[PDB]
């Protein structure tokens, strides 16, 4: 060992983003400590359980593609085979083929941080319980999300 890639927090074949230029392809997201968004076929979205190993990629439903659009926009898109987009309630739900406003997203990175802000001009998060729902736009500490992408490196 003594040597690999120090800078960036990479595991596997995943590597966090540094930019909006850099999000792009199939990417994933991880919003606790270990745990991703998981994809329910009803039309719902939980937290899946997190990894017990250290290097370990996510599951086939829990990898998101993401897709450029415009205004610094992205398209995400669940493994399932539909569109993350927001209800009316504010939770986040994947059942659609497009990419309409509710299916938009828009990053952001201030001071290192990142969060998902969803077209509503709100955060997004989950609950302990595992409900997936739309957060005011104050940005708490968990809000924070790890962007990683598993694209083409340059190594």
Avoid at 134 to 144: D, L, S
Wanted: glycine share 12%.
């Amino acid at each position: 060992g003594s040597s690999g890639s120090s800078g960036l927090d990479i595991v596997g074949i995943w590597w966090t983003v540094s930019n909006f230029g850099e999000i792009s392809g199939t990417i994933a997201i991880e919003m606790d400590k270990g745990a991703y968004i998981h994809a329910l076929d009803n039309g719902l979205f939980t937290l899946g359980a997190p990894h017990r190993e250290v290097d370990e990629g996510p599951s086939p439903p829990e990898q998101f593609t993401a897709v450029k659009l415009s205004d610094s926009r992205i398209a995400l898109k669940s493994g399932y085979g539909k569109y993350l987009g927001i209800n009316s309630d504010g939770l986040v739900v994947g059942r659609s083929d497009a990419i309409g406003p509710r299916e938009q997203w828009e990053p952001v990175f201030q001071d290192g941080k990142m969060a998902l802000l969803a077209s509503n001009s709100c955060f997004i998060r989950c609950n302990e319980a595992g409900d997936i729902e739309a957060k005011n736009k104050t940005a708490g500490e968990e809000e924070m999300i790890k962007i990683r992408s598993c694209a083409e490196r340059e190594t």
